[PDB]
Motif scaffolding. Structure first.
Motif, PDB file in Angstrom:
ATOM      1  N   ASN C  13       8.191  92.158 102.393  1.00 56.31           N
ATOM      2  CA  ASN C  13       9.246  91.916 101.434  1.00 56.31           C
ATOM      3  C   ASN C  13       8.707  91.157 100.238  1.00 56.31           C
ATOM      4  N   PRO C  14       8.612  91.827  99.080  1.00 50.98           N
ATOM      5  CA  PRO C  14       8.059  91.106  97.952  1.00 50.98           C
ATOM      6  C   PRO C  14       8.945  89.938  97.462  1.00 50.98           C
ATOM      7  N   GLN C  15      10.212  89.916  97.863  1.00 53.28           N
ATOM      8  CA  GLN C  15      11.065  88.770  97.524  1.00 53.28           C
ATOM      9  C   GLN C  15      10.736  87.512  98.312  1.00 53.28           C
ATOM     10  N   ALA C  16      10.216  87.672  99.532  1.00 56.29           N
ATOM     11  CA  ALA C  16       9.966  86.534 100.429  1.00 56.29           C
ATOM     12  C   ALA C  16       8.595  85.911 100.224  1.00 56.29           C
ATOM     13  N   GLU C  17       8.407  85.267  99.074  1.00 56.16           N
ATOM     14  CA  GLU C  17       7.172  84.534  98.743  1.00 56.16           C
ATOM     15  C   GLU C  17       6.967  83.380  99.731  1.00 56.16           C
ATOM     16  N   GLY C  18       5.764  83.250 100.283  1.00 57.59           N
ATOM     17  CA  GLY C  18       5.462  82.169 101.231  1.00 57.59           C
ATOM     18  C   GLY C  18       5.711  82.594 102.660  1.00 57.59           C
TER      19      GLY C  18
END
Ligand SMILES: Cc1ccc(C)c(Cn2c(CO)nc3ccccc32)c1
Lengths: 134, 140, 140
Positions: C13-18
């Motif tokens: 998921n590129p939204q879920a950084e970290g």
């Protein structure tokens, strides 16, 4: 559906030897393993795939892995799929191969490396060779 | 004979500064509907496909910063957009290095979709032997 | 005339950084013929030989005061419900750098096996674009 999945012998000295009767090694519907080569049982389209794994401890070696087609009528050996790595503390370098090919009945298939002294035959999973009729 | 749409295309070695796909070569395929148009593979019917590509890059030593990329892309006719399905970016680094990038996966594709396989640096491609640079799909 | 082979290809998921969140609900990601994505893990619906494959991509800016990058694929069997490593890799990337890690192999898997694909440094993960980070199985 002729299929075959062979693996490397962990009990082998300085050699890349394909076994069928190892743990988890199909080899069905007429796909022979003779002279370390998969012999194609019938003419048609096949997915051909491979993997090998090299390891060493520190370091000019080039590691190559290559699948060839030894034609049944012609009779010479042609690269189908091939790659090269340059490994330069222990290291691990796999090489992946695979693709789809029109093959003839009787053609043979090789899956070979140049440096079997760097081969990692420590278990299975990632040193294999196989074909699947479509 | 299988009716499964398949294709296996190979790089043109004397394509200068280009990654050019050919089918009219030994051990290369377009079958059961797959077309090669404008350097792209067009799919003839919907369903699950395996998609795969290999390039092999090679430099002589390193003076830098050099980056290598390999990208398989999809144009869906319905959306008229170009999206990466598989992409690797790699930093190599007077002895010779090699970096083979193999990209594979399974995908749901639609009739008329177009598939690209491209790199950033055609000059770094190596063609010492045959079978080093290829692009293919296999309908499941 | 569809294939009945358990297949799956899931993406970061590129939204879920970290973090590393696998998604089948995203363009060009899928589950088919009984494969589930549960608690960030792929579930095998029937026994047999499977190709398991994955790529993660690491990017960093300069090299700090020493960094080990790992990627591991694990199996939780019904008969033995604890993580067993199937595949594993480590790299030292040492001014941006990019370091992809690839893992795959063929394994005998049982019904209800749970497969995991994890990194130790989610903060170095790069998914500015699709196709860079993925994880999947294909029944042979
Ligand atoms: C993900 C993937 C998608 C398509 C293809 C052709 C491969 C090649 N491949 C490889 C490459 O090492 N191993 C395999 C084992 C079984 C089937 C295909 C295989 C891998």
């Amino acid at each position: 559906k002729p299929v075959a999945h062979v693996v490397a012998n962990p009990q082998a000295e300085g050699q890349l030897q394909w076994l069928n009767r190892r743990a988890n090694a199909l080899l069905a519907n007429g796909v022979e393993l003779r002279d370390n080569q998969l012999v194609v049982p019938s003419e048609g389209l096949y997915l051909i795939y491979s993997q090998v794994l090299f390891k060493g401890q520190g370091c000019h070696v080039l590691l190559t892995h290559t699948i060839s087609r030894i034609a049944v009528s012609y009779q010479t050996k042609v690269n189908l799929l091939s790659a090269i790595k340059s490994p330069c503390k222990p290291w691990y370098e796999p090489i992946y191969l695979g693709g789809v090919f029109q093959l003839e009945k009787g053609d043979r298939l090789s899956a070979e490396i140049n440096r079997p002294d760097y081969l990692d035959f420590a278990e299975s999973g990632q040193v294999y060779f196989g074909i699947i009729a479509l």
